[PDB]
A paper describes a structure:
To avoid this stability problem, we replaced the conserved lysine with an arginine (K47R) instead of an alanine. RIP2KK47R crystallized in a different space group (P212121) with two quasi two-fold dimers (denoted AB and CD) per asymmetric unit and the structure was refined at 2.6 Å resolution. The inactive state of RIP2K resembles the Src/CDK-like inactive conformation, with the DFG motif in the IN state and the Helix αC outwardly displaced. Helix αC has rotated by ~17 degrees out from its active state position (calculated using the anglebetweenhelices command in Pymol). Due to the consequent rotation of Leu70, the R-spine is broken. Density for almost all the AS was visible showing that it is structured as an α-helix, as described for the inactive states of EGFR-KD and CDK2 and the monomeric BRAF. The AS helix encompasses residues 167–178, thus including the phosphorylation sites Ser174, Ser176 and Ser178 while residues 180–184 remain disordered. Interestingly the helical AS from monomer A in the AB dimer projects outwards towards the active site of the asymmetrically related monomer C from the CD dimer, forming a putative substrate-enzyme phosphorylation complex. Despite the fact that ADP was added in the crystallisation buffer, no nucleotide is bound, probably due to the bulky arginine blocking the ATP binding site and the sulphate rich crystallisation medium. Thus, the asymmetric unit of the RIP2KK47R crystal shows two quasi 2-fold symmetric dimers, with a slightly altered and weaker dimer interface at the N-termini than is observed in the active state.
Author numbering: 9 to 179, 186 to 200, 205 to 297
Amino acid sequence: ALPTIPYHKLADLRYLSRGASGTVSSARHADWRVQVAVRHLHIHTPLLDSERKDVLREAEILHKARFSYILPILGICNEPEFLGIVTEYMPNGSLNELLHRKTEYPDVAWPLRFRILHEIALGVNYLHNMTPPLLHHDLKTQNILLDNEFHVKIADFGLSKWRMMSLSQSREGGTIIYMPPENYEPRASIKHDIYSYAVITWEVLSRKQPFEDVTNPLQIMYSVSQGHRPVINEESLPYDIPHRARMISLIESGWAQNPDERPSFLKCLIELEPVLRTF
């Protein structure tokens, strides 16, 4: 039930960014007369009938996700030399930008930070409650996209066989700060996303870069496999943070070394719901 958008309907392709999962461009849809984003791959090697139908079936599965805080797939661009995922364009970039561009936003109020946290949690919760469940497996501040009025849309969920394609078209690497230590030695584990969520939650409340001072990413990887985490004290997480106790609980249970110890997103929601009634 996933539409095919022909290449020619996407005008004014401006490059925005590239990573493991391909290139991100803005475009104008010629018929809808709105802006769209497109994640795409220029495919160098020809691509087997088996391998193409795989990526399409994935995209078709991911198309089924329709929820307020999920960035929905609008259609697939399926060209001989070009594969593309067309999504709504998000004017305000990512959560990454809202937190760390401290010049452009000197002040990110508590009610907003907490609404973001709630919406991420509702998003991943929805994803996990699909049949079959849809796991994100690369949740990070860059995927948490912000619409015109700073509401959350989670992007790039379930891009598994897609990411193996942009692997193939090489013959660099994405951030590991939100990756649970089990995953370092490659899996199908429901408790991956909650680890990421926990690190995100730390980042949202601290407004600090996780492992900021640690220069080598392998250093980070060793540290966390030995159970080290972003530091929780008065400097990183000030005493004035609303519901500080409850949030630290959520964070620590979230990034627990043992997967079994980590909450479901339903558990986050139950815990968060009281916090939000404050605002």
